[PDB]
Amino acid sequence: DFEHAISDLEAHNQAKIGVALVSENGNLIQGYRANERFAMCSTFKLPLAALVLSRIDAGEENPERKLHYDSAFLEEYAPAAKRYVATGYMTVTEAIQSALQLSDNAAANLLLKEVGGPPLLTKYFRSLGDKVSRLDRIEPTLNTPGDERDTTTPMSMAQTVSKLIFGDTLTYKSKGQLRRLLIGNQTGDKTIRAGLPDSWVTGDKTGSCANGGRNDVAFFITTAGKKYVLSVYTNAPELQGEERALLIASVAKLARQYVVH
């Protein structure tokens, strides 16, 4: 069974693995450590992008709005922001695309400023019925034992993402935009979607975090038209990076045994 298979993976890789596979409507299909906390150092950007789109939906923001910043605002991993910084700004749209598809840290910080900071994103999680996920600090500060700051659970994240991608909190327009952006993610070619058939439509947001953290949350649609979200959080400090991605792809190959192909 699923729980024994993931346990075997933990023991073989000296890793901690948390995973939830949920239906289109957020209902759990299989999981393993599904209600344990993991650091949410990058995957928070997915719900962050959705908050920004929902502000646009409500007329409180628009896509072409210029988010001003200078070199002091740069972070160590900010490939897009470093290219645009001489101009003085990134638009809302550029920052959303960069934070999602490149996991650009300065772009994510721009979007955090836009929405009112970590507390307003936490309020957004709560508003969507996610009682667990919380963001407290900005990049890269958000990345000790017992500290619940900047954490999610595999279940909370899968459920949240399922609501954003497949539910009705975003308009049809925004939901389409968010999905197309996630499909075009550039950082997830070796993670969850490497463990799924290539004919399935898949979009994802990855993360790489302290203590050997390598995470991915994806939506996918099988050739039968059946829609799912898979969250995978891993800590495998003895594995190399290519091996950590392969571990996530292995988890997805296990989880897909439980979906209608």
Ligand X SMILES: *C(=O)[C@H]([C@@H](C)O)[C@H]1C[C@@H](SCC/N=C\N)C(C(=O)O)=N1
The answer to whether 41 contacts ligand X (rule: CB under 6 A) is yes
The verdict on 208 binding ligand X (CB under 6 A) reads yes
User: Minimal CB distance to Cl ion: which residue?
Assistant: 207
Helix (H, G, I), strand (E, B) or coil at 66: strand
C-alpha 110: how far from its chain's center?
A: 17
- Whichever of 94 and 139 has its CB closer to ligand X, that residue is 139
Query: Is residue 231 at the binding interface for ligand X, with CB under 6 A as the rule?
Result: no
- Choose the catalytic residue: 7, 23, 42, 156: 42
- Interface mask toward Cl ion for 199-238; x: CB under 5 A: --------x-------x-----------------------
- What's the one-letter identity of residue 77? Y
Write the DSSP symbol of residue 191. Answer: T
**Residue 106 lies near ligand X (rule: CB under 6 A):** no
Q: Is 206 in the site for ligand X (CB under 6 A)?
A: yes
Helices (H), 105-240: 105-115, 118-127, 154-166, 172-183
User: Three-state DSSP class for 29?
Assistant: strand
Q: Is 103 a catalytic residue?
A: no
Using alpha carbons only, what angle is made at residue 223 by residues 177 and 178, rounded to the nearest 5 degrees? 10
Q: What is the amino acid identity at position 172?
A: Y
Q: Which is nearer to ligand X, 148 or 189 (CB)?
A: 189
Interacting residue with Cl ion among 5, 10, 16, 24 (CB under 5 A): 24
- Report the alpha-carbon distance of residue 162 to residue 60 in Å, rounded: 24
At position 71, the amino acid (one-letter code) is: S
Q: Counting contacts by CB under 5 A, is residue 174 touching Cl ion? A: no
235 touching ligand X, by CB under 6 A? no
Please, which residues have CB within 8 angstroms of residue 105's CB and are 6 or more apart in sequence? 75, 76, 77, 78, 81, 139, 140
Provide the residue type at 106 as one letter. Answer: A
Q: How far is the CB of 39 from Cl ion (least distance, A)?
A: 7
Contact between 187 and ligand X by CB under 6 A: the answer reads yes
**What tokens were used for 91?**
């638009």
In whole angstroms, the minimum distance from the beta carbon of 139 to ligand X comes to 6
Give residues in contact with Cl ion (CB under 5 A). 23-25, 41-43, 207, 215
Which amino acids are annotated catalytic?
Answer: 42
Give residues in contact with ligand X (CB under 6 A). 41-42, 77, 103, 105, 139-140, 143, 187, 206-209
